Every structure is written in C-alpha cells, then in structure tokens.
Amino acid sequence: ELLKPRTLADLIRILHELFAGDEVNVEEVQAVLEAYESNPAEWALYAKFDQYRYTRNLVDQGNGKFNLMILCWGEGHGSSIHDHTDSHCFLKLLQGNLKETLFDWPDKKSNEMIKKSERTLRENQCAYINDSIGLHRVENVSHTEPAVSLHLYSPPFDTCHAFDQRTGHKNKVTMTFHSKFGIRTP
Ligand SMILES: N[C@@H](CSOO)C(=O)O
Numbered sequence: 329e330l331l332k333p334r335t336l337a338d339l340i341r342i343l344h345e346l347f348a349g350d351e352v353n354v355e356e357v358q359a360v361l362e363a364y365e366s367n368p369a370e371w372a373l374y375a376k377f378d379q380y381r382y383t384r385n386l387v388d389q390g391n392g393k394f395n396l397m398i399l400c401w402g403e404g405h406g407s408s409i410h411d412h413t414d415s416h417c418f419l420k421l422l423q424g425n426l427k428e429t430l431f432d433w434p435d436k437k438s439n440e441m442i443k444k445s446e447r448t449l450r451e452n453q454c455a456y457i458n459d460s461i462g463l464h465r466v467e468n469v470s471h472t473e474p475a476v477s478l479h480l481y482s483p484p485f486d487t488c489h490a491f492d493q494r495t496g497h498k499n500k501v502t503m504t505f506h507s508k509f510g511i512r513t514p
C-alpha cells in the first residue's frame with residue numbers, strides 16, 4: 329500500500345519496503361517519489377555543489393538493492409550522453425529545472441547521434457529511464473538557477489558509458505561520490 333511520504337526520511341523508509349523483494353514495480357516507485365514534496369531543509373545536508381560540474385551525493389545505500397543520491401547542478405552544468413548499466417534509474421527534481429534529451433542506442437557504424445526527443449523536467453516531477461528506453465543527457469540550462477535532483481538506481485552501479493555525440497562511440501566511465509551521508513569524500 330503506497331502512502332504519501334511525509335518527509336525525505338519517510339520516503340527512504342518507504343523505498344526500503346518497495347525494494348524488499350527481488351523485482352521493482354516501476355510505476356509504484358515513480359509515484360511515491362513524485363508524491364514526496366521537496367523540502368529544502370530536509371536535504372540541504374546533501375546538496376553540496378561544485379563550481380565546475382555537477383556533483384553526486386549519496387543519501388542512502390538501500391538494502392543491497394538500490395542507491396539513493398542527490399545530484400547538484402550549477403548553472404549550465406550537464407551530463408554526457410550516457411546509459412544506466414542495466415539498472416532502473418529514477419530522477420525526481422527537488423529544485424529548479426533540468427532538460428532531458430533522449431537518444432537511441434547507436435549502431436556499430438559511426439554516425440551523429442540525433443536526439444529523439446527532449447523535455448523539461450520541473451520541480452517535484454519524477455522521470456524514469458532504463459537502457460531499454462534509450463540513452464539520455466541531462467542538463468541544467470538555466471543561467472540563474474542551480475538545480476537539485478534525487479536519483480534512485482536499482483541495482484546500484486558505479487560505472488556507465490558516455491557516448492560521443494558526433495560518432496556514437498562509447499567510453500566506460502567510473503562514477504564517483506562527491507559526498508556520502510553528508511560527508512565530503514574527496
Ligand atoms: N545518470 C546520471 C544522472 S542523469 O541520470 O537520471 C548520474 O547518475 O550521474
């Protein structure tokens with residue numbers, strides 16, 4: 329039974345229940361993420377920005393089944409075009425707006441990767457991606473407003489591929505945490 333999370337801590341407790349088993353009900357998880365109303369005081373501890381690129385801040389390590397983290401995007405900060413390593417990936421906006429651009433998996437032949445679609449993700453909305461859906465790029469295109477997002481990945485993963493938009497060629501990247509549980513982890 330899905331109830332509205334009252335706070336980030338409550339959301340975390342609910343997520344531990346939803347991931348207690350071996351499978352994932354994507355629509356239920358997205359619905360509970362969306363139902364949490366962002367409260368900046370509750371996540372300020374994790375919202376550690378860097379001037380030059382977006383940061384990844386671990387909030388909860390789940391139950392062996394997922395990682396929950398907060399990403400902090402300065403003005404103009406964005407990602408590579410990337411995949412999600414055979415995992416579910418939910419993104420909920422906590423502050424600001426992000427542009428998500430979708431791309432198909434490239435063919436083996438070298439070619440420009442042309443966007444398939446794009447949308448603006450707005451405060452409190454929860455999006456979902458997985459490799460079956462495609463690849464994406466996520467960007468804070470604002471010149472004036474930093475963005476903060478809450479991401480849930482299941483299973484957890486710490487490597488992915490970045491894709492060259494000009495050719496479709498991929499390179500393996502190791503992801504790092506800027507902080508864990510509020511503690512900077514240089
Ligand atoms: N997947 C990117 C963020 S966009 O992914 O919803 C990352 O975890 O760094």
Ligand SMILES: [Fe+2]
Pocket residue numbers: 410411412417464466
């Ligand atoms: Fe992503």
